[PDB]
């Protein structure tokens with residue numbers, strides 16, 4: 001996946017007008033947008049096609065799929081029918097639940113991103129201790145796309161070691177949560193940035209600033 | 218705790234509005250509590266919650282297995298309750314802060330949170346099972362009153378009930394299609410969640426009636 005400027009916009013605004021306006025203001029800096037439930041549950045799944053029609057950007061559906069196999073299949077099918085190019089799936093629920101997603105993705109020509117360790121403090125309670133094994137599970141399952149925490153560079157580095165240089169890795173927690181753009185890109189192929197951009201007084205300048213700080217990357 | 222008619226909750230996972238409405242309407246006399254998840258919501262929109270409320274006199278549990286960071290969890294819960302959901306199901310594995318975020322919104326908005334501890338599918342044994350007892354204990358410490366546990370593992374469901382106490386409300390999926398037995402599950406759960414056994418039956422109403430007949434003494 002070729003992500004422009006190694007920067008993925010996490011569009012979590014919950015108003016269609018604002019989401020479209022802000023995304024449009026930074027369209028020259030990105031070509032990949034992560035759309036999650038905050039926007040989808042507020043404006044509907046039709047928003048995905050709207051983004052593709054207006055920006056032609058690739059869309060990653062951040063739905064952190066975490067159900068049983070049967071339900072995961074249905075969620076992925078509904079998501080790809082809406083036009084999403086990829087979907088993010090939790091690995092904690094096990095291999096069968098991930099495989100269900102991989103199957104639908106293959107059938108519809110899409111990609112599955114496996115979320116290993118999360119970026120928030122609570123991730124230390126249960127997820128962190130299982131993260132390395134979740135990553136190895138992804139490798140065993142043939143997963144090629146992963147999500148790891150910008151807030152813990154040492155953990156992000158370990159994830160990269162496990163999946164190898166050929167795998168694709170994206171990382172959230174940059175900016176608002178404390179992660180550094182440049183440091184994160186030492187291990188991740190692309191950084192995910194939400195609030196630092198969409199809540200900034202000038203989203204365009206915010207995006208431009210982040211890119212300037214990693215221009216050598 | 219919510220008064221679930223016949224201790225039976227319908228897992229409405231059909232993805233077609235017409236079929237979902239037809240089947241739910243056919244079993245309306247047996248169930249007053251419906252669990253709506255992403256298969257239906259992502260196919261028909263959040264307005265489906267509004268339509269179910271209008272068409273049926275049913276309580277709605279939004280099975281969204283919320284599993285994000287605190288900030289995003291808050292937004293998901295707000296949008297879900299704004300749509301009319303009486304309660305929302307949240308994953309406990311992402312940690313205490315993520316669960317607390319949901320509890321805070323539920324408190325502010327006058328709704329309820331259900332904490333999913335262990336899951337019913339085979340894959341749950343890989344990582345969730347080993348953390349389930351602690352996730353449940355965490356829920357108790359956080360003040361969680363509603364929980365979700367697996368019917369497919371009676372021994373685990375029994376332990377979960379012990380951890381949360383008799384006062385807590387516990388609902389359990391995995392009955393029917395996944396192998397769980399209605400009666401045995403109700404030994405520990407306040408209500409059973411049933412999907413395919415009912416919505417894929419030639420006569421959903423007869424399927425629901427049959428399940429209820431088997432647990433009549435309970």
Ligand SMILES: O=c1cc(O)n([C@@H]2O[C@H](COP(=O)(O)O)[C@@H](O)[C@H]2O)c(=O)[nH]1
Nearest residue numbers: 010118119172173176193194195286289
């Ligand atoms: O571990 C993870 C996984 C995520 O997808 N995310 C998501 O990435 C985005 C981060 O946004 P922000 O830059 O505003 O903190 C959110 O949409 C969030 O749900 C995260 O923050 N941590």
Ligand SMILES: O=c1cc(O)n([C@@H]2O[C@H](COP(=O)(O)O)[C@@H](O)[C@H]2O)c(=O)[nH]1
Nearest residue numbers: 068071228336337390391394411412413
């Ligand atoms: O551990 C769990 C948690 C669930 O919510 N569920 C949900 O409960 C329902 C079970 O449906 P069914 O009776 O068709 O197997 C589904 O909507 C599923 O997503 C489950 O099966 N196991």
